[PDB]
Amino acid sequence: LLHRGYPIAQLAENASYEEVIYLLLNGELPNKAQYDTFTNTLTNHTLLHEQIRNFFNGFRRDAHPMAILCGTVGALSAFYPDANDIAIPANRDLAAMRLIAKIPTIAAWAYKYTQGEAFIYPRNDLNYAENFLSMMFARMSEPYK
Amino acid sequence: STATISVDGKSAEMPVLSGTLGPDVIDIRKLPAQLGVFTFDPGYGETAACNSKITFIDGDKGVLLHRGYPIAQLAENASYEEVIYLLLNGELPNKAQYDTFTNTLTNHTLLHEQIRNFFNGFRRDAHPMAILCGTVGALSAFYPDPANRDLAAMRLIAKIPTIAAWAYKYTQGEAFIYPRNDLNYAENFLSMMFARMSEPYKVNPVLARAMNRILILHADHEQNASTSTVRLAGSTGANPFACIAAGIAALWGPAHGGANEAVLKMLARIGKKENIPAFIAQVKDKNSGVKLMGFGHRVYKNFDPRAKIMQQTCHEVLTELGIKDDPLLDLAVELEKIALSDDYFVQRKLYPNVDFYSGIILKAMGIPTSMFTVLFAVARTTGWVSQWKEMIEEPGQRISRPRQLYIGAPQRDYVPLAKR
Amino acid sequence: STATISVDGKSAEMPVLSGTLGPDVIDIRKLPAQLGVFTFDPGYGETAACNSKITFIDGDKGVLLHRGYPIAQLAENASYEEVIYLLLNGELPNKAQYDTFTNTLTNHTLLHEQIRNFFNGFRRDAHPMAILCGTVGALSAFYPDANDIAIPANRDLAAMRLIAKIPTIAAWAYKYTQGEAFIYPRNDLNYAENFLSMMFARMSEPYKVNPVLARAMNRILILHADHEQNASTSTVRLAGSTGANPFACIAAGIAALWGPAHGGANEAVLKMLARIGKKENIPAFIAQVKDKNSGVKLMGFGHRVYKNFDPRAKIMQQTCHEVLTELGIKDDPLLDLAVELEKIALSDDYFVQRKLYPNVDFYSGIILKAMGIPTSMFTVLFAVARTTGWVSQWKEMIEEPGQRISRPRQLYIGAPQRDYVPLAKR
Ligand SMILES: CC(C)(COP(=O)(O)OP(=O)(O)OC[C@H]1O[C@@H](n2cnc3c(N)ncnc32)[C@H](O)[C@@H]1OP(=O)(O)O)[C@@H](O)C(=O)NCCC(=O)NCCCC(=O)O
Numbered sequence: 008l009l010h011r012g013y014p015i016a017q018l019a020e021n022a023s024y025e026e027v028i029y030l031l032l033n034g035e036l037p038n039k040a041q042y043d044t045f046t047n048t049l050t051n052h053t054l055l056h057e058q059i060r061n062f063f064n065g066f067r068r069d070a071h072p073m074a075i076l077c078g079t080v081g082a083l084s085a086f087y088p089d090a091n092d093i094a095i096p097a098n099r100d101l102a103a104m105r106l107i108a109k110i111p112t113i114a115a116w117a118y119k120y121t122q123g124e125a126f127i128y129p130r131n132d133l134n135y136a137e138n139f140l141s142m143m144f145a146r147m148s149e150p151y152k
Numbered sequence: 153s154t155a156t157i158s159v160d161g162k163s164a165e166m167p168v169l170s171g172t173l174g175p176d177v178i179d180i181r182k183l184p185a186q187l188g189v190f191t192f193d194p195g196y197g198e199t200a201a202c203n204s205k206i207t208f209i210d211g212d213k214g215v216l217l218h219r220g221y222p223i224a225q226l227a228e229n230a231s232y233e234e235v236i237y238l239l240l241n242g243e244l245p246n247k248a249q250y251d252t253f254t255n256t257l258t259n260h261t262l263l264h265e266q267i268r269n270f271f272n273g274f275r276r277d278a279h280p281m282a283i284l285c286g287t288v289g290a291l292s293a294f295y296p297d298p299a300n301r302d303l304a305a306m307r308l309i310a311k312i313p314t315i316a317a318w319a320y321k322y323t324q325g326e327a328f329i330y331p332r333n334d335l336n337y338a339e340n341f342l343s344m345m346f347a348r349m350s351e352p353y354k355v356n357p358v359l360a361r362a363m364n365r366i367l368i369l370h371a372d373h374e375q376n377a378s379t380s381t382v383r384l385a386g387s388t389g390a391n392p393f394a395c396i397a398a399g400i401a402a403l404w405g406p407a408h409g410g411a412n413e414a415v416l417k418m419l420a421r422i423g424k425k426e427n428i429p430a431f432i433a434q435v436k437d438k439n440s441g442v443k444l445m446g447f448g449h450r451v452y453k454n455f456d457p458r459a460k461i462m463q464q465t466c467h468e469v470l471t472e473l474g475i476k477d478d479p480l481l482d483l484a485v486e487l488e489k490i491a492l493s494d495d496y497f498v499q500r501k502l503y504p505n506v507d508f509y510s511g512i513i514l515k516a517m518g519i520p521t522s523m524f525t526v527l528f529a530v531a532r533t534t535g536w537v538s539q540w541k542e543m544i545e546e547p548g549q550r551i552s553r554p555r556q557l558y559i560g561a562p563q564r565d566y567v568p569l570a571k572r
Numbered sequence: 573s574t575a576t577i578s579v580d581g582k583s584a585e586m587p588v589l590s591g592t593l594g595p596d597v598i599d600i601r602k603l604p605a606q607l608g609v610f611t612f613d614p615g616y617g618e619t620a621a622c623n624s625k626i627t628f629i630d631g632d633k634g635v636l637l638h639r640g641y642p643i644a645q646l647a648e649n650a651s652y653e654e655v656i657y658l659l660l661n662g663e664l665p666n667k668a669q670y671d672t673f674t675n676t677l678t679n680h681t682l683l684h685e686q687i688r689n690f691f692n693g694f695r696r697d698a699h700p701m702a703i704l705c706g707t708v709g710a711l712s713a714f715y716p717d718a719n720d721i722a723i724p725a726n727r728d729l730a731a732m733r734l735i736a737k738i739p740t741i742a743a744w745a746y747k748y749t750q751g752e753a754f755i756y757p758r759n760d761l762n763y764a765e766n767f768l769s770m771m772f773a774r775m776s777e778p779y780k781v782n783p784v785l786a787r788a789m790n791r792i793l794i795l796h797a798d799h800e801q802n803a804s805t806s807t808v809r810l811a812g813s814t815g816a817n818p819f820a821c822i823a824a825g826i827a828a829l830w831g832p833a834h835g836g837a838n839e840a841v842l843k844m845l846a847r848i849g850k851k852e853n854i855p856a857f858i859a860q861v862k863d864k865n866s867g868v869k870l871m872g873f874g875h876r877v878y879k880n881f882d883p884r885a886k887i888m889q890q891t892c893h894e895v896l897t898e899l900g901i902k903d904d905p906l907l908d909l910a911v912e913l914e915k916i917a918l919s920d921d922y923f924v925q926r927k928l929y930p931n932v933d934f935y936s937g938i939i940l941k942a943m944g945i946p947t948s949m950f951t952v953l954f955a956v957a958r959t960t961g962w963v964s965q966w967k968e969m970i971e972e973p974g975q976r977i978s979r980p981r982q983l984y985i986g987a988p989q990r991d992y993v994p995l996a997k998r
Pocket residue numbers: 195376406407408409410411435442443444445446447448449450451500502505506507976977
C-alpha cells in the first residue's frame with residue numbers, strides 16, 4: 008500500500024496525520040511553510056455554523072452515530088451553495104478543507120448527542136488527533152487532559 | 153413479653169417488641185385474625201410503621217442520633233459527605249472508603265443534556281419546588297432499570313443539587329452553571345447557584361462551612377411525612393426517582409418543609425417586636441387558621457436539637473460575615489421567648505423546630521426565600537434514599553396498604569339519570 | 573363501649589368505634605400517653621388510617637361500593653362522568669348538576685401550551701408512567717394558588733382541573749412516545765370518547781370513534797376510578813396531609829401506582845401471560861410461583877383486602893368476552909390462557925390456603941390490548957381513571973374537621989449512642 012509513492016508503514020510510523028492529509032490532497036509531503044498554511048486553514052474551519060445544533064435534535068438519542076453523520080454532513084451542503092456547481096480551482100480546495108476540518112467536529116457532537124453530554128468545541132491549540140479526543144471525551148466538570 | 157387486648161368479650165396476646173432505644177411497641181399484625189378489629193389511628197402518630205437502624209429521636213428529651221451519633225457532633229465535626237455515607241451505609245467512612253465515595257458522587261453530578269428541555273416547560277415565575285418535583289419525577293424516565301440500589305441512591309444524591317441549582321438559575325433567567333469536580337458537595341452547590349458568566353466565581357469559605365452544616369442538619373429525620381411518603385410509594389416496587397419526586401411533593405407542604413419559607417414571610421409580616429402581641433393573639437385565636445410557623449413537632453415535645461444548632465449557626469455566620477445586627481434574627485429570638493413563656497404554647501409542648509431559624513441563615517448566605525424548601529429537599533434527598541434503600545432491602549418487605557373506618561352511605565341501588 | 577389494652581402491668585381503656593359497614597376499630601390516639609408504647613404494624617394492614625365516606629370494601633365477601641352503590645351496578649349502568657361526580661361529591665348528579673359538571677370538565681381539558689416543552693425533556697423511549705409522573709408534577713407550577721388550602725371552591729377547582737387534564741397529558745405522553753402529532757381535546761366528545769380520540773386520531777384522516785371501544789373505555793375507567801385506601805391513594809393522602817399542592821400530590825400517587833405490586837401489575841400480567849405463551853407451559857410457571865425462594869409471583873392474583881374474588885375482576889373478565897364478541901374476534905389466545913391459569917391456580921392448595929384470587933389487573937390488559945392500547949400505556953390508563961379517586965380522597969382528607977399531618981413512628985433497632993470518631997482513627 009503506497010500513498011503518493013510512500014509505503015503505509017513509513018507514514019504510520021513517522022508522519023503526523025495532517026502531513027498525510029496534505030499528501031493525499033496535494034501530491035507531495037509538505038515543507039514547513041506549506042504545513043503551517045495548511046494546518047492554519049484547517050483550524051480556521053473546524054467550527055460549525057451554530058444553526059447546525061438544531062439538526063442533532065432531529066435525532067432520537069439512541070440514533071446510530073453513522074446515521075447522524077450521514078444526515079448532518081448531507082445537511083451541511085446547504086450552508087455552502089456555491090459548492091453546488093464549482094468551476095474555480097481555489098473553491099474546490101476550500102470545499103475539501105472545510106469537509107476535512109468539520110467532519111471531526113460533527114462526529115464528536117454526534118457522539119456527545121447520543122451520550123446526552125454537552126457539546127465540546129474544537130481547540131486551536133490541539134492538533135487533529137488531540138482535538139478529536141478532546142471533543143469526544145472532555146466533560147463540563149473538569150479540564151480535559 | 154406480651155400485651156393483652158380484649159374487645160367484645162374476647163382477649164388475645166400480642167408480642168411486645170423492644171428497640172435499641174425508644175418505647176416498646178405492640179405487634180398488631182395478627183389483630184384482625186385474633187379479634188376481628190383494626191386499630192384506628194388517623195395521623196399515624198401512635199403507630200410504628202417500620203423497623204429502622206438509620207436515625208433515632210427521643211422527642212420528650214430532644215435527642216437526635218444518626219446511626220448512633222449525636223446530631224451536634226456531626227454538625228460540628230463532619231463533612232456533609234461523611235454524613236451522607238453514614239446515613240446510607242451505617243458507619244463513618246475511613247479515608248479509603250471516603251475517597252471512593254466522593255469519587256462516585258462526582259462521577260454522577262452531570263445531568264443528561266435533554267433534561268434542559270424540561271426546564272423550558274415552566275414559566276419563569278414557577279416556584280422552584282414545582283420545578284424540582286416535576287424534573288426529578290421526569291428523571292425516572294432516564295433510569296428505567298443491590299449495587300443497582302446503591303447506584304440509584306448515589307445518582308439521586310449527586311444529581312439533585314444540579315437540578316436544584318438549574319431550577320434556581322432558570323427562575324432568574326441566568327445561564328446554567330455546571331458542577332465542578334474540584335469543589336466539594338457544599339461548595340459546588342454554592343457555585344452552581346451563584347456563579348455568573350461574566351467572572352470566575354470565588355467560593356466564600358464562610359458560606360461553604362455554613363452550607364456544609366445546613367445540609368447535615370436537614371439530611372434525615374426518621375419517619376417524617378416526606379420520608380413516609382417515599383417509603384409508601386417505594387413499597388410498591390416503584391422507581392426510586394419517582395419515589396423521591398413523591399417525597400419532594402410532601403415536603404413542599406407548609407406543615408412540613410414548606411414551613412421554612414412560611415417562617416420568613418411570617419417574621420417579615422410581623423415586621424417588628426411591637427407587632428408580636430397582635431400576632432400571638434391570632435395564633436391563640438382558635439379558628440383563625442394562623443399558626444406560629446417554625447414551632448411544633450409531631451415527635452419533639454421539647455427543644456429540637458437542630459434548632460439550637462441552627463440558632464448558634466445564625467450567630468456564628470453573621471459574626472464571620474461582619475454583620476453586627478440582623479433585625480430579623482432579633483425578632484425571631486424575641487418571638488421564641490414570648491411564645492415559650494405563654495401558657496398556650498407551654499401546655500401544648502410547642503417549641504422551635506428546625507424551620508424557625510433556617511431561613512434566617514439561608515437568607516444571610518444570599519439564598520432567596522423561593523429556594524429554602526428546595527435546599528431542604530437537596531439535603532433530605534440523602535435521608536430519603538437511605539430510608540428507601542433500607543425499606544426495600546429489608547427481609548419480608550410488604551406493600552404499604554392501610555385500612556379505614558367506613559362511615560358513608562349504606563348499600564343502595566343505582567337510579568338512572570332520567571329518574572334523578 | 574371500649575377495649576382494654578394491658579402491657580407491662582398497666583391497663584387502659586381505648587374507645588371502640590364502628591362504621592356503617594366493616595369491622596369495628598380500636599382508637600389508639602391516646603395509647604402513648606396511657607401506656608407508654610406505640611403499636612407496631614409495618615405494612616399498615618391492621619391500622620385504619622382514616623374515616624371515609626367514599627368507598628367501602630368487604631374483603632372477605634368481595635364487595636365493593638362507591639358512595640353506597642355496588643361497582644357492578646355502576647359499571648353496567650353509569651357513564652364515567654356520573655361516577656366521577658359521585659366519587660367527588662357524594663351523590664349521583666341530577667340532569668342540571670350533570671350538565672354543569674361536564675361543562676366544567678370540558679372547560680379545563682386544554683393544557684397551557686408551554687407544557688409542550690416538558691415533553692421534549694424526555695427521550696422518545698421513555699416509559700409513559702415517567703412522563704405522566706413528571707409532567708403532572710410540573711403542572712403544579714401553573715397553579716401556585718393551590719400551594720394553599722384556604723377556600724372550599726378552590727379545592728373543587730383543583731380537583732376538576734386534575735380530572736380534566738390528566739387524560740390530555742396521558743394522551744400527549746402516548747403520542748410523544750410514538751412520534752405522532754399531539755391531538756387536542758374535543759368538546760363534542762365525552763370523557764371516554766375524547767380519550768380514545770386524543771390517543772389514536774391521526775393527522776391524515778378524521779378519526780371515527782368506534783362505539784364498541786367507547787363503551788369499553790367507559791367501563792374500564794369506572795372499574796379503576798377508586799379503591800379505598802390502596803398504596804397510591806394512601807400516598808396521595810400522606811403527601812396532601814402536609815398541605816402540599818394537590819397537583820404534586822397526584823404526581824406522588826402516580827409514582828406509587830407505577831410499582832409492579834400496585835398498578836404496574838397490569839403491564840406485568842400481560843408480559844407474564846406472553847412469556848407462558850401456551851397452556852402447556854402453565855405447570856412450569858406455577859412451580860416457580862410456589863417455589864419458596866424464587867420471588868416470582870402470579871401477577872394479577874392476591875390483594876391486601878380481598879380474600880375472595882375481586883368484584884372488578886369478575887366484571888373485567890365478562891367485559892373481555894363482551895368486547896371481543898362485539899369486535900368480531902372469535903378467539904383471543906391470551907384470554908384463553910389467562911382463564912385456564914385462573915382455574916389451575918384456584919384449584920391449587922398454595923393459592924387456596926393463602927386466599928389468593930384474581931384482582932383487577934388480571935384481565936384488564938387483555939381488554940386494553942383489544943382496544944388497541946399498547947402495553948406501555950396500561951398503567952397510565954389506570955392512573956387516568958384513578959386520578960378521580962385520588963382527588964376525591966385528597967379533598968375528603970383535607971376538608972375533614974380535625975385533619976392533621978400524617979407522621980408515623982418507628983421501632984429503632986440501630987446502633988446505641990456513640991461519640992464521633994475523627995477520620996484518622998476509623
Ligand atoms: C409540626 C406540626 C405539623 C405537628 O403537627 P401535630 O403533631 O398534628 O400537632 P398537634 O395537632 O397534635 O397539635 C397539638 C396542639 O398544638 C396546636 N399547635 C400545633 N402547632 C402549632 C403551632 N405551630 N402554632 C399554634 N398552635 C399549634 C394544635 O392546634 C393543638 O392545639 P389544640 O389541642 O387546642 O387543637 C404542627 O406543630 C405545625 O403545623 N407546626 C407549624 C408548621 C411547622 O413549623 N412545620 C414544620 C415542622 C418541621 C418540618 O416538618 O420541617
